[PDB]
Design an enzyme around this catalytic site. Structure first.
Site, PDB file in Angstrom:
ATOM      1  N   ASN A  80       0.827  -1.203   0.000  1.00 43.22           N
ATOM      2  CA  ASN A  80       0.000   0.000   0.000  1.00 43.22           C
ATOM      3  C   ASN A  80       0.865   1.258   0.000  1.00 43.22           C
ATOM      4  O   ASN A  80       0.391   2.340   0.343  1.00 43.22           O
ATOM      5  CB  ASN A  80      -0.897   0.021   1.244  1.00 43.22           C
ATOM      6  CG  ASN A  80      -1.707  -1.245   1.402  1.00 43.22           C
ATOM      7  OD1 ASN A  80      -2.549  -1.562   0.566  1.00 43.22           O
ATOM      8  ND2 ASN A  80      -1.447  -1.985   2.477  1.00 43.22           N
ATOM      9  N   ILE A  87       1.402   7.165   0.340  1.00 45.02           N
ATOM     10  CA  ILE A  87       0.646   6.183   1.114  1.00 45.02           C
ATOM     11  C   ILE A  87      -0.827   6.167   0.724  1.00 45.02           C
ATOM     12  O   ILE A  87      -1.456   7.223   0.633  1.00 45.02           O
ATOM     13  CB  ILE A  87       0.742   6.497   2.619  1.00 45.02           C
ATOM     14  CG1 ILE A  87       2.210   6.622   3.024  1.00 45.02           C
ATOM     15  CG2 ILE A  87       0.044   5.415   3.426  1.00 45.02           C
ATOM     16  CD1 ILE A  87       2.415   7.112   4.427  1.00 45.02           C
ATOM     17  N   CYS A  88      -1.378   4.981   0.481  1.00 39.24           N
ATOM     18  CA  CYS A  88      -2.789   4.899   0.130  1.00 39.24           C
ATOM     19  C   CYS A  88      -3.592   4.230   1.237  1.00 39.24           C
ATOM     20  O   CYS A  88      -3.731   3.006   1.292  1.00 39.24           O
ATOM     21  CB  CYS A  88      -2.993   4.177  -1.209  1.00 39.24           C
ATOM     22  SG  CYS A  88      -2.420   2.476  -1.276  1.00 39.24           S
ATOM     23  N   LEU A  89      -4.103   5.065   2.134  1.00 39.00           N
ATOM     24  CA  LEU A  89      -4.912   4.596   3.241  1.00 39.00           C
ATOM     25  C   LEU A  89      -6.318   5.164   3.089  1.00 39.00           C
ATOM     26  O   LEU A  89      -6.502   6.326   2.719  1.00 39.00           O
ATOM     27  CB  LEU A  89      -4.307   5.021   4.585  1.00 39.00           C
ATOM     28  CG  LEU A  89      -5.056   4.546   5.837  1.00 39.00           C
ATOM     29  CD1 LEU A  89      -5.312   3.050   5.755  1.00 39.00           C
ATOM     30  CD2 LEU A  89      -4.250   4.879   7.081  1.00 39.00           C
ATOM     31  N   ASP A 120      -6.001  -3.784  -2.614  1.00 37.41           N
ATOM     32  CA  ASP A 120      -5.871  -2.329  -2.733  1.00 37.41           C
ATOM     33  C   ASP A 120      -4.395  -1.958  -3.022  1.00 37.41           C
ATOM     34  O   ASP A 120      -3.905  -0.921  -2.546  1.00 37.41           O
ATOM     35  CB  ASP A 120      -6.384  -1.705  -1.418  1.00 37.41           C
ATOM     36  CG  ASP A 120      -6.099  -0.211  -1.278  1.00 37.41           C
ATOM     37  OD1 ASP A 120      -6.429   0.547  -2.217  1.00 37.41           O
ATOM     38  OD2 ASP A 120      -5.570   0.224  -0.225  1.00 37.41           O
TER      39      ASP A 120
END
Length: 150
Positions: A80, A87-89, A120
């Site tokens: 991720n 960062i992909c949160l 994801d």
């Protein structure tokens, strides 16, 4: 920001350390309360343990309504997260609320490191290795941890 997001920051800080994470740390870099930096320690029982990760937090002028702009400065072998530390949160925009604090986001990423989101991916191959075989995944990360976060 005016003077509101700014006070929001101060509050975020003064409260940030009233009860210190003993594992993570974040604060304003220099004289800019809108430009922060943080440091996360790899959870002892995770692939990234013993490592030090640097994060750069940028506060949006309209905060706390919009989420904070944070990037991972330290190289990390995570599905991720990519080569530029982006960062992909979910809570970073998809499920973010004014209520949540920078502190919150820290523990969020902290657990994210431990338990990543495979479907994801931000990096398909590392996400494919996790899902298909974590046994191998949890080594690369260690190799990268002591080669990029020691």
């Amino acid at each position: 920001r005016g003077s509101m997001a700014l006070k929001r920051i101060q509050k975020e800080l003064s409260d940030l350390q009233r009860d210190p994470p003993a594992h993570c740390s974040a604060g304003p870099v220099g004289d800019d309360l809108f430009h922060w930096q943080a440091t996360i320690m790899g959870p002892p029982d995770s692939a990234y343990q013993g490592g030090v990760f640097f994060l750069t937090v940028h506060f949006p002028t309209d905060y706390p309504f919009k989420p904070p702009k944070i990037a991972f400065t330290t190289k990390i072998y995570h599905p991720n997260i990519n080569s530029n530390g982006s960062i992909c949160l979910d809570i970073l925009r998809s499920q973010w609320s004014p209520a949540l604090t920078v502190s919150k986001v820290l523990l969020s990423i902290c657990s994210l490191l431990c338990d990543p989101n495979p479907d994801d991916p931000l990096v398909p191959d590392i996400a494919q290795i996790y899902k298909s075989d974590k046994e191998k995944y949890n080594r690369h990360a260690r190799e990268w941890t002591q080669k990029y976060a020691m």
